[PDB]
């Protein structure tokens, strides 16, 4: 299990690094990205929307990795807690 | 968000190391610890059950750290997904 966790943690670090780089390049905060994606915030002028496909994919990867880590953690539950 | 995640990842590595040490001292696999805690495996003789108090505390901390990450990830939901 700890082998599985360590691999996922490494992948999460990588995913975070990618997202931070993409946000830096896009000149956008993570918060603003989410608000734009959900339809609440207008695209700021200056921001290149062409980054959004990759950002979306990487954010989905991060979510999936966190979910996968939690699935491993289910093996540590005793009596479901 | 990302500063929080980075700290949690570091705390998870620390927690894992602490558990590995306790398991080494106890001469117990993580798998066996869980099997014994859940009632499925008898206490092997030679194993000092006194280790179970700290092992349980540290495994609880590891679970709570992973849960903290789960909760952070909830902020990345868009349209509830
Ligand atoms: Mg094991």
To one decimal, the resolution in angstroms is 1.6
Contact with chain B for residue A9, Cβ under 8 A: yes
Residue for token digits 């999936």? A64
DSSP string for residues in B3-33: HHHHHHHHHHHHHHHHHHHHHHHHT--HHHH
Which fold is adopted by the domain A1-81?
Methane Monooxygenase Hydroxylase; Chain G, domain 1 (1.20.58)
How distant is the Cα of A63 from the closest Cα of chain B, in angstroms? Answer: 6
For B79, which DSSP code? Answer: T
DSSP string for residues in A23-76: HHHHT--HHHHHHHHTTSSPPPTT--GGGHHHHHHHHHHHHHHHHHHHHHHGGG
**b/e per residue, A22-55, with b = 16+ CB within 10 A?**
bbeebebebebbbebbeeeeeeeeeeeeebbeeb
Contact with chain A for residue B59, Cβ under 8 A: yes
Is the CB of B73 less than 8 angstroms away from the CB of A59? no
CA atoms of A10 and A8, how far apart (whole Å): 5
Is the CB of B20 less than 8 angstroms away from the CB of A2? yes
- Ligand 1 centroid – CA B25 distance (Å): 15
Experimental method: X-ray
Using CA atoms in the order B60, B66, B72, B77, what is the torsion angle rounded to 10 degrees? -120
For A78, which DSSP code? Answer: S
Cβ–Cβ under 8 Å, residues B34 and A75:
yes
CA atoms of A52 and A57, how far apart (whole Å): 8
Q: Give SS3 for B80.
A: coil
Contact with chain A for residue B74, Cβ under 8 A: no
Task: Please name the residues in contact with B44: beta carbons below 8 A apart, sequence gap of 6 or more.
Answer: B28, B32, B36
Chain B positions touching A75 (Cβ under 8 A) are 34
Cβ–Cβ under 8 Å, residues A25 and A34:
no
For testing contact with chain B, the best of A73, A75, A79 (most B CBs within 10 A): A73
């Amino acid at each position: 299990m700890f082998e599985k966790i360590r691999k996922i943690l490494a992948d999460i670090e990588d995913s975070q690094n990618e997202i931070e780089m993409l946000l830096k390049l896009a000149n956008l905060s993570l918060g603003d990205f989410i608000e734009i994606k959900r339809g609440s915030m207008d695209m700021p002028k200056g921001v290149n929307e062409a980054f959004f496909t990759q950002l979306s994919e990487e954010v989905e990867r991060l979510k999936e990795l966190i979910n996968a880590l939690n699935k491993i953690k289910k093996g540590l539950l005793v009596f479901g807690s």
